[PDB]
């Protein structure tokens, strides 16, 4: 029945097909540019041509879903679109961008560096990351006041001097203390954390008192339904490590409610004699002035909830703010606790050393 030994072709044809399917959904539903496509045909063209310039029945192929996302990101980043990995994670974990099947029923940083050596970033594309929108994304993601965008943008310039890249790739696998935390975004997040920590816990002109660290913390902590927070809950549900699942334990009836809403909407994007017996069996018990508020609405009101702006246990407030931020980042950027702190650790010693 099924092909043998050179279904390499059908493999690459369901793969290619599934990719173009995803692009259809990101220009259409995510209002990308038509140019993305040609950028993608070029990159997947490059690596298709490289596996077909190492093609052999002695076959060594590893086209994963991760490869699909990797060339979307790769291509986006040449195009300097302000999209970041966390966009992609949210997208795929939400069953919105098709993924999590072979043809539905009818490691990202590491595979982007991997592809990023597979065909070379340097003399074919421009692999500067869209840094400044990552900053904006980040300050808005906290409720940090717009000064911190320049705060961090400065520390960024201080260590890197504005330059950011996509290969820490030589084919090698045995990596230890050499060339890792060389994927840029992670360093940006690290800088971001550091900034908040130094910046706050060391402005002796403390313009920022003993307490607005607290009010900041609480306006950060208040579980309140918008699209975004609801999303981050939806991500939290598929994030590998506790605690971020104790989190669904602590949801509010409103959070749970918008949850079941999203449930019955995007699990009509569900997957999969007795078959019709369960088509009926399930169709026995029933499948089935605007309220909750927008992003900048919520954002406004926490900015106001702190608008009363105008003592080493504030170090505490610093720490719990940092660790909350951290958590949001871990789920949002699909990495590990221990990964993050490896990076911020390394790069903080990397800042002390290039100032000391």
């Amino acid at each position: 029945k099924l092909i043998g030994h050179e279904a390499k072709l059908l493999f690459l044809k369901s793969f290619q097909f599934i990719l173009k399917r995803q692009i259809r959904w990101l220009i259409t539903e995510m209002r990308f540019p038509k140019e993305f496509e040609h950028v993608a045909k070029i990159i997947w063209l490059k690596i298709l041509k490289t596996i077909n310039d190492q093609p052999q029945e002695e076959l060594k192929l590893q086209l994963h879903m991760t490869s699909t996302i990797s060339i979307l990101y790769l291509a986006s980043t040449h195009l300097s679109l302000p999209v970041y990995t966390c966009d992609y994670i949210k997208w795929i974990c939400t069953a919105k961008m098709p993924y999590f099947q072979a043809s539905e029923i009818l490691q990202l940083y590491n595979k982007i560096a991997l592809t990023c050596g597979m065909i070379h970033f340097k003399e074919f594309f421009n692999s500067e990351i869209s840094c400044q929108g990552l900053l904006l994304k980040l300050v808005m993601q906290c409720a940090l006041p717009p000064e911190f965008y320049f705060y961090t943008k400065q520390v960024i310039e201080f260590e890197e001097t504005d330059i950011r890249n996509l290969t820490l790739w030589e084919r090698t696998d045995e990596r230890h203390t050499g060339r890792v935390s060389n994927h840029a975004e992670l360093r940006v997040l690290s800088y971001f954390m550091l900034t908040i920590n130094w910046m706050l816990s060391f402005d002796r002109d403390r313009q920022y008192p003993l307490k607005w660290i607290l009010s900041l913390t609480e306006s950060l902590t208040q579980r309140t339904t918008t699209s975004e927070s609801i999303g981050r809950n939806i991500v939290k549900v598929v994030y590998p490590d506790k605690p971020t699942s104790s989190d669904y334990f602590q949801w509010s009836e409103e959070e749970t409610l918008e949850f079941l809403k999203w449930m019955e909407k995007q699990f009509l994007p569900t997957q999969t004699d007795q078959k019709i017996a369960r088509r009926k069996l399930y169709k026995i018990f029933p499948l089935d002035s605007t309220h909750q508020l927008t992003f900048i609405e919520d954002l406004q009101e926490r900015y106001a909830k702190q608008t009363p702006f105008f003592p080493p246990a504030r170090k505490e407030a610093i720490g719990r703010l940092l660790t909350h931020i951290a958590s949001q980042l871990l789920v949002d950027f699909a990495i590990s606790k221990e990964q993050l702190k490896d990076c911020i650790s390394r790069i903080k010693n990397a800042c002390l050393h290039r100032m000391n």
Binding site: L12, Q16, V39, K46, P146, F295, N349
Partner: protein, 587 residues
């Protein structure tokens, strides 16, 4: 249902829940993916004298730090539950459980204290007067065989160690030290786990010996032994603690909650019934608290874990004529980053207890009510990040804090005047000469895109996306809508073909998560948000909408005419069946 319509669809009661009320009380390879078998703290009223006197609520606690210590002190109850002043004593090894028992009102309501440990097993007496407590260590016995005892039950010291058990007796007060006879053993080579357990059932010489596989009733002082009715199949004995003056029993096995109790006098089981509560967690223990009233006698069932600080509760009641029923599950949390080693107890419900948590030398009284009519972060992984400072590294941190503080001053005073000039004729001069200034350079790079077009080995030309080397170029305007109009008329200008094209709005979508048509409404939204806060909003929000609009400025490769060229020139060098693998517009 069963009795109500034997007698010839909803619950008896309405929907009850669970509230808190808290107080402070005490305060004392590489493989922790497993755990040993240990428990480790008691609180119980015991009768010191008994020259017509009452009981005194005592705590027996553990000072640990360095493993090996034992604490005793009285607790004056009323409501805020306290102490007076401490009294302590260690042993050369590690405490594995402290227990102190009380057989019920058949008798003389009294006790004294006992504890078992890594290579030693001891039992203590006590007298007390004037709020000092004086206890008195009736001799240990270092481990006769080089084994180790799981459980003590208790005037009968009964030990259980990794299978084999012994009944034994304690001395009366002095030097003489504790002997035994009547031994025995359960044993099951295929019980890999080390915990077994012994506890009284009924009262006269009927014990229960347990391992995570089976339940063994052993009637000593006769000769008797039974494997009860399950074992070793779909679930594990997970815990068992004896409820009730003498004749009550509570067993946790996976999800079944089991109440055994007596019948035919001695020696019985109950398949009365059970609830089922839901894991695979090897760590799971139970404890009961009991309360009374006329029409029932209710048991509150606390099953808790070592993995999460949720507490899982069920409720049974004892009707005079050996009768039990249930109602519906309820579960609570409390503060995070840890988990419990002690949960232990003593038209509404009051249930109250104390907990200890993993690796927190801290005892907390808790109290739970039916209704309402009436992070200390030391994540060693993160603080080690946020300090990592000598003294010259404290001031080394303070350095660039000051540096970009005065720098941010430079930014503020700089931009201010540009903000002054918002709509001047001057700023029109600048947006003009700047706009087609740019245009001249943009043409130049388009020319050295003529000269090197024939490459067709890539499609990303040189390095493009810039202000295109004017640094004076960017920074100096202030109006956002006249700068958006600049760009709209520059895109309009190079509308002569073979050019990069990109549409910002559809992309600000990614930013504010709503349709962001104009470049301007983008600035509006941000300015609302940040005018609420620390405002130099007007300025910064302009300065960052300027940075974003720069960072994104679609200055980039020649288009379509040039993708469809390398697309095919590599699409060729790939042979054959891969020339048809390179397939687009599927369906």
């Amino acid at each position: 249902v069963q009795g109500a319509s034997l007698y010839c669809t909803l619950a008896e009661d309405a929907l009850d829940l669970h509230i808190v009320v808290k107080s402070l009380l005490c305060d004392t390879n590489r493989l922790d993916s497993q755990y040993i078998q240990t428990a480790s703290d008691l609180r119980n009223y015991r009768d010191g004298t008994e020259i017509i006197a009452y009981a005194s609520g005592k705590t027996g606690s553990v000072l640990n730090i360095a493993v090996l210590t034992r604490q005793n002190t009285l607790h004056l109850n009323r409501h805020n539950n306290v102490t007076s002043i401490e009294l302590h004593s260690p042993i050369k090894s590690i405490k594995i459980p402290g227990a102190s028992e009380s057989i019920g009102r058949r008798s003389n309501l009294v006790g004294i204290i006992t504890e078992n440990s890594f290579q030693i097993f001891r039992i203590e007496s006590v007298h007390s007067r004037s709020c000092d407590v004086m206890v008195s260590s009736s001799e240990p016995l270092y481990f006769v065989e080089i084994d180790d005892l799981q459980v003590v039950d208790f005037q009968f010291a009964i030990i259980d160690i990794k299978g084999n058990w012994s009944i034994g007796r304690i001395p009366k007060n002095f030097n003489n030290q504790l002997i035994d006879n009547l031994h025995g053993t359960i044993f099951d080579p295929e019980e890999l786990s080390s915990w077994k357990r012994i506890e009284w059932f009924s009262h006269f010489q009927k014990i229960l010996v347990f391992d995570r596989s089976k339940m063994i009733e052993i009637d000593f002082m006769n000769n008797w032994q039974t494997e009860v009715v399950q074992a070793k199949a779909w679930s594990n004995i997970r815990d068992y603690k004896r409820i009730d003056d003498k004749n009550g029993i509570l067993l946790t096995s996976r999800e079944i909650i089991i109440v055994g109790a007596s019948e035919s006098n001695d020696p019985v089981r109950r398949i009365s019934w059970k609830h089922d509560l839901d894991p695979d967690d090897t760590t799971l223990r139970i404890t009961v608290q009991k309360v009374k009233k006329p029409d029932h006698i209710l048991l509150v069932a606390f099953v808790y874990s070592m993995r999460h600080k949720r507490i899982y509760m069920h409720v049974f009641s004892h009707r005079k004529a050996n009768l039990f029923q249930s109602l519906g599950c309820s579960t609570v949390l409390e503060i995070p980053g840890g988990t419990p080693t002690g949960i232990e107890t003593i038209f509404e419900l009051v249930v109250d207890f104390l907990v200890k948590l993993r690796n927190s030398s801290e005892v907390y009284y808790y109290a739970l009510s039916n209704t309402q009519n009436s992070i200390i972060v030391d994540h060693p992984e993160w603080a080690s990040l946020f300090n990592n400072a000598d003294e010259r590294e404290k001031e080394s941190i303070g350095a660039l804090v000051s540096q970009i503080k005065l720098k941010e001053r430079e930014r503020i005073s700089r931009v201010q005047n540009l903000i002054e000039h918002e709509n001047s004729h001057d700023e029109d001069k600048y947006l003009q000469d700047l706009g087609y200034r740019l245009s001249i350079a943009t043409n130049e790079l388009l020319e050295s895109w003529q000269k090197t077009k024939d490459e067709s080995i890539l499609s990303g030309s040189l390095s493009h996306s810039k202000l295109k080397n004017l640094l004076e170029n960017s920074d100096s305007f202030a109006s956002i809508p006249e700068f958006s109009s600049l760009l709209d008329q520059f895109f309009q200008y190079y509308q002569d073909q073979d050019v990069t094209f990109i549409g910002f709005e559809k992309l600000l979508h990614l930013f504010l998560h709503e349709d962001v048509p104009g470049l301007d409404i983008f600035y509006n939204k941000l300015l609302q948000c940040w005018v609420l806060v620390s405002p130099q909003a007007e300025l910064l929000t302009k300065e960052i909408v300027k940075d974003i609009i720069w960072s994104l400025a679609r200055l980039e490769k020649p288009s379509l005419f040039e993708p469809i060229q390398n697309e095919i020139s590599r699409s060729l060098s790939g042979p054959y069946q891969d020339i048809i693998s390179s397939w687009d517009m599927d369906d």
